[model samples]
Target: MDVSFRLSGATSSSYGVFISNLRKALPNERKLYDIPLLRSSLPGSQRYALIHLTNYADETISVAIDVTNVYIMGYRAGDTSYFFNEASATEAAKYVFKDAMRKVTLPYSGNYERLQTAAGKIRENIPLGLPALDSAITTLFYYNANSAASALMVLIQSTSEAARYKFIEQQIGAAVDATFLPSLAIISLENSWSALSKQIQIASTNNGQFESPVVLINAQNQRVTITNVDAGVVTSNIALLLNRNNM
Candidate 1:
């Protein structure tokens, strides 16, 4: 899991102070610091800067310079290895600004058990040489299975977008396969019971900015809009309806 620290309500002077302390947080530790510029290849391209910082302990911090958001992450080398202690990452950040500034710690909120399972599935098939690709796939599993964030962002860096997509789709399908069916039985999808299904335009997209609509369905025949729902969620919704109806 990855943790984040937000320097909310920070003043301009605080930026330099935080950066300086962050650099000296660990003594005699070799650090990496880079400002990578990101730009769209299309016409009227906009440029953005990402400041990357990392330490020898496999701890990293990504600062979206334009957005003023900082994400702290730690990882182990092997599949059998345990995740880097999130508390250590948090303490590092706190140490950086113990007195000079205020920072809000954001929890690492992902289902690690399922994520580990998904990573195992990927390693069994895909060639794992590229760190970028590995991180991308891990991120896809982390966010898509847990949040509404699109997992398509990393496709550009993948050697084969088709392969990555297919693998990710399969992995996610397997994760939800068992529960998805049972969930469908519980959710009442009956149109006669005031249940309706409609596909509405949403501000989400896949790799090519292809619109992925938010599916609106009548769950349990109640007029509730289930947001950020995927196929598995739809089944679960319907299953919930059946349970509610039975009760």
Candidate 2:
């Protein structure tokens, strides 16, 4: 049995195809550690999803040519499947364990979901709210999914700068205080490069240049770059991001 996720728009695609596009976007998907990022880990109903594409790759599915949302899919060599759609990662994260894959794979085989959850959990465990540079991200894409109008994280890309981000955290935290930490995600570049890149593709974050680490804020339908990223920039822009999002 195989269980996966997808980002859909007004119309969703197939199961295999969703995983397939995600596979293309994430070639290194098979090589990463199993749930490299949560120490701990959802609610719901039992809904059955028909197998739109049994061959998996030939299912002809992918994120629609529009803004995306979250969908959980389950498939085995059987006659039936399961799925759940949610707006935010927080809800989807819980659904992955609580509702979506409840019957697909036992013993929790979705390491990727665990990794994302780890990213959020580890941040809370870090002292001084500063994660090591190896676990730092270059960009964060934030949006509000209307399922309940909650924050949806598009991606958390890692960088190779524990030291640079450590300094940035010091500057931001000292000035902005730690209030911005929860609303903001800090990731290690080396460890989270795949995590970040996948979101860039999955979320279709093409409006801005990804040449360097950048922050993007999305308002339901529109996306804007929050910062160009600089080692020397102050926390005002970062402050604005937190103030604008969840405070």
Instruction: Give me the candidate number with maximum lDDT.
Output: 1
Worst 10 residues of 1 by lDDT: 29-38
lDDT of 1 by residue, 105-166 (tens): 32331223332343443222322222323344455323333321111122221211111122
* lDDT (Cα atoms) of all candidates against the true structure: 0.26, 0.24
Highest TM-score among the candidates is held by which one?
2
Backbone clash tally (model 2): 11
lDDT of 2: 0.24
TM per prediction = 0.19, 0.20
After superposition, candidate 1 runs with Cα above 4 Å error: 1-85, 95-115, 118-122, 125-127, 131-247
**Tens digit of per-residue lDDT, candidate 2, span 157-218:** 11012111233333222321122332233433223333333332322344422344534322
